[PDB]
Amino acid sequence: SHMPYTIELIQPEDGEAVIAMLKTFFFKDEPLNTFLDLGECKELEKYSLKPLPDNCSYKAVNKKGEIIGVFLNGLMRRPSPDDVPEKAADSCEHPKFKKILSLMDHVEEQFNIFDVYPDEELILDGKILSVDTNYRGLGIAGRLTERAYEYMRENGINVYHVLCSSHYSARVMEKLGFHEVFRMQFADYKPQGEVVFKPAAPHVGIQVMAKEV
Ligand SMILES: CC(=O)SCCNC(=O)CCNC(=O)[C@H](O)C(C)(C)COP(=O)(O)OP(=O)(O)OC[C@H]1O[C@@H](n2cnc3c(N)ncnc32)[C@H](O)[C@@H]1OP(=O)(O)O
Ligand SMILES: OCCc1c[nH]c2ccccc12
Ligand SMILES: OCCc1c[nH]c2ccccc12
Ligand SMILES: OCCc1c[nH]c2ccccc12
């Protein structure tokens, strides 16, 4: 049997298994990744492992011990009064991944989640969410998300922030009790005067989603 599954804290020694799962699914089937045909992307591998030592990322593991879902989260801190805002895309050599990092930089230049919550110093950031295709539609995304609420409660974190790359994923977060705090249509994202991302019409654009727990 493959069911039931558990939800467990991701450990540093899980890095290779996490990357293997993401390469099978997220790298190929997150909408922007598939639109670009990301391919091999060691920089996304490194990006995905970065939040693990924050000790608040979760894996769904089936009855055979295989990872069938992950939600990789990191703590984000309010920029210091003397902050030097850096563009993440400036340190990326992979051209396709750079386009995604540039989109993230653009969102952050237009919208600062910390402006919404002036009293908060630390906010949980949901960075990478992926569920194995054969296990989709079972509520695993919600159970991964709910495990983060436990971490938030234990540590007095009030806000969970998730940048969603498609209305499809934003709708999942809405079902889980998140609400939109910022949006941008792909048709309106023209950093150098021209559209960069043209996925299918139902995706629409990015929505930053937030929940206060
Ligand atoms: C911060 C970020 O990572 S943003 C990018 C988010 N990740 C991606 O886009 C990667 C590709 N997508 C996925 O991995 C998954 O679709 C996820 C993680 C978004 C959702 O995971 P799931 O555990 O399937 O979520 P859930 O069980 O709530 O199903 C969501 C919706 O998918 C639909 N769905 C239903 N059955 C299936 C199925 N077999 N396969 C795919 N979708 C299904 C339903 O519309 C369902 O909503 P509903 O059950 O409330 O009616
Ligand atoms: O918040 C953005 C989530 C995301 C969508 N596509 C990606 C590719 C690499 C890393 C993160 C993302
Ligand atoms: O191919 C679309 C992949 C997808 C991304 N987010 C979702 C949410 C629900 C169902 C499918 C998706
Ligand atoms: O259902 C689509 C709702 C929507 C309106 N404007 C947007 C911009 C980005 C993502 C989604 C939307």
Numbering used by the authors: 18 to 230
What does the literature reporting this entry say, word for word?
Acetyl coenzyme A (Ac-CoA)-dependent N-acetylation is performed by arylalkylamine N-acetyltransferase (AANAT) and is important in many biofunctions. Dat exhibits an ordered sequential mechanism in which the cofactor (Ac-CoA) binds first, followed by the binding and acetyl transfer of the substrate. Overall structures revealed that Dat was a globular protein containing a tunnel-like cavity, a substrate located in the middle of the protein, a CoA group located at the bottom, and an acetyl group between the substrate and CoA.
To compare the structures before and after catalysis, two ternary forms, Dat/Ac-CoA/tryptophol (mimicking the enzyme-substrates complex) and Dat/CoA/Ac-TRYP (representing the enzyme-products complex), were obtained through cocrystallization and solved at resolutions of 1.28 and 1.36 Å, respectively. Tryptophol is a dead-end analog of tryptamine for N-acetyltransferase because the amino group in tryptamine is replaced as a hydroxyl group to form tryptophol. The two ternary structures before and after catalysis were very similar (RMSD = 0.65 for all atoms). The backbone carbonyl oxygen of Leu180 may form a hydrogen bond with the active nitrogen atom in Ac-TRYP, while a hydrogen bond with the hydroxyl group of tryptophol was also possible. Therefore, we considered that the role of this hydrogen bond was to position the active nitrogen atom in the substrate. The backbone amide hydrogen of Leu146 also formed a hydrogen bond with acetyl groups either in product (Ac-TRYP) or cofactor (Ac-CoA). In the ternary complexes, Met-aromatic interaction was proposed between Met121 and Tyr64 and between Met121 and Phe114. A bottleneck (the narrowest site) in the cavity surrounded by Met121 and Asp142 was also created after Ac-CoA binding (radius of 1.9 Å) and changed to become wider after substrate binding (radius of 2.4 Å).
